[PDB]
Amino acid sequence: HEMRAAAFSTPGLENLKLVEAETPRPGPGEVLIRVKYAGVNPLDYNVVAGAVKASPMPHIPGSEFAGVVEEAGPGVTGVSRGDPVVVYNRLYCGHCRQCLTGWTQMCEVTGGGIIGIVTQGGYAEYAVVPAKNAVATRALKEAATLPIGALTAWNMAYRASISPGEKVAVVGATGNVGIYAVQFAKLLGGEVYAISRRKAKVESILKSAGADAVLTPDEAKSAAPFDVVLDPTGSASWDLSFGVLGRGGRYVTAGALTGAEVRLDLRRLYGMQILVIGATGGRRADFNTVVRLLEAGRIKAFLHNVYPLADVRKALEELRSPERVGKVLIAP
């Protein structure tokens, strides 16, 4: 059996090519999934561009996908052929200190290894994952926005300890993570201030996602202080995100694995009793929660475009586009 796939033998977007590949077969504890939709994320871009080493080489990227189970590996029970599933993207052992306390994305054994980075991912017709990573859902186009976009945002909001009344600023609120951070900050009862430079073009979308106000970076300085800043853009908005925080403010940062180094004002940190909280991925337990919330309609998938596998390079480049407002998906 042969399948279509987007693969690169050397990093660089220019080397990402449509190829024909041996359709993998699921081993013990694994399932084979017919990928229906895969997300296009800064992480996928950075994998292809070479900012993070991938395996195997040549490499099929794509760390966020949903599809239908094609074959269950020997001794696999719990999910079976025909089941629509969405895939939690971290490999985890289930027996180390981190997995047993819920932080599967910190697994000491797998290093937090990401499907589509340390294994072949979803920019292909078929992919093999662990069966325990595959979550049956009745939601697949919307579900394919969950493994990175929604789950990362949930994990940030969870780690910020937002409480009703608290002023929450979301930097990068039009990005895949930020759009779900707006939603989760509102669902936890926050007063939600969404920040984008394109406020005029995007204000309707962001309020639809739960924002109480949309602000440019310079206006947010005037709306300070905030009790929480959710900043999924890494080091990119560090200067603005730290200075708008009030007493006891929580700055939650996540990122897409690219170089990020900043200058921390210790005097302000200790004087204001601010917390700078790292977040990455999400817990395996909370992925089930995010899937159920999508099924219940309590969170929403904001889609910009769906592209065939053959347009994967243009889809990746559309992450940079000022006209893009929402998620870009690939459909093998």
What phi, psi does 270 have (nearest 5°)? -75, -40
- Position among 99, 129, 185, 293 found at the interface with Zn ion (CB under 5 A): 99
Bridge partner list, 248: none
Distance CA 94, CA 212 (A): 40
Distance CA 39, CA 256 (A): 14
Tokens linked to 247: 């007493």
* Closer to Cl ion by Cβ: residue 84 or 122: 122
Is 140 within 8 Å of 118 (Cβ atoms)?
no
State the nearest-atom distance from the C-beta of 120 to its own copies, in Å.
Answer: 25
- 175 part of the interface to Cl ion, by CB under 5 A: yes
- 24 part of the interface to Cl ion, by CB under 5 A: no
- 93 part of the interface to Zn ion, by CB under 5 A: yes
84: left (phi over 0), alpha (psi -120 to 50) or beta: beta
Q: Rounded to whole angstroms, what are the CA distances from 223 to 51, 71, 247, 253, 270?
A: 36, 53, 15, 20, 22
- 96 part of the interface to Zn ion, by CB under 5 A: yes
What phi, psi does 33 have (nearest 5°)? -120, 135
- Binding pattern to Zn ion, positions 273-312, x when CB under 5 A? ----------------------------------------
Residue 59 binding partner per list its own copies, Cl ion, Zn ion, none, with a CB distance cut-off of 5 to 8 Å that depends on partner kind: none
Percent of the chain as helix, strand, coil, to the nearest 5? 30, 25, 40
* Closer to Zn ion by Cβ: residue 100 or 262: 100
Q: Find the residue with minimal CB distance to Cl ion.
A: 175
Is 143 within 8 Å of 292 (Cβ atoms)?
no
State the nearest-atom distance from the C-beta of 89 to Zn ion, in Å.
Answer: 15
- 273 part of the interface to its own copies, by CB under 8 A: no
State the nearest-atom distance from the C-beta of 62 to Zn ion, in Å.
Answer: 23
Name the one range near its own copies by CB under 8 A: 17-25, 48-56, 124-132, 181-189.
181-189
- 56 part of the interface to its own copies, by CB under 8 A: no
Tokens linked to 53: 């080493």
- 205 part of the interface to its own copies, by CB under 8 A: yes
104 CB-contact burial (10 Å; exposed 0-12 / middle 13-18 / buried 19+): buried
Distance CA 143, CA 88 (A): 11
> Taking CB under 8 A as the criterion, which residues in 223-252 touch its own copies?
none
> Taking CB under 8 A as the criterion, which residues in 109-148 touch its own copies?
141-142
State the nearest-atom distance from the C-beta of 287 to its own copies, in Å.
Answer: 11
Q: Is 43 helix (H, G, I), strand (E, B) or coil?
A: helix
- Position among 63, 110, 120, 176 found at the interface with Cl ion (CB under 5 A): 176
Give the Cβ contact number of residue 318 at 10 Å. Answer: 16
- Position among 274, 329, 330, 332 found at the interface with its own copies (CB under 8 A): 329
Total residues interacting with its own copies, rule: CB under 8 A: 44
Binding site for Zn ion (CB under 5 A): 92-93, 96, 99, 107, 109
Binding site for Cl ion (CB under 5 A): 175-176
Binding site for its own copies (CB under 8 A): 141-142, 163-165, 184, 187-189, 191, 198, 200-205, 207-208, 212, 289, 292-293, 296-298, 300-307, 314, 318, 321-326, 328-329
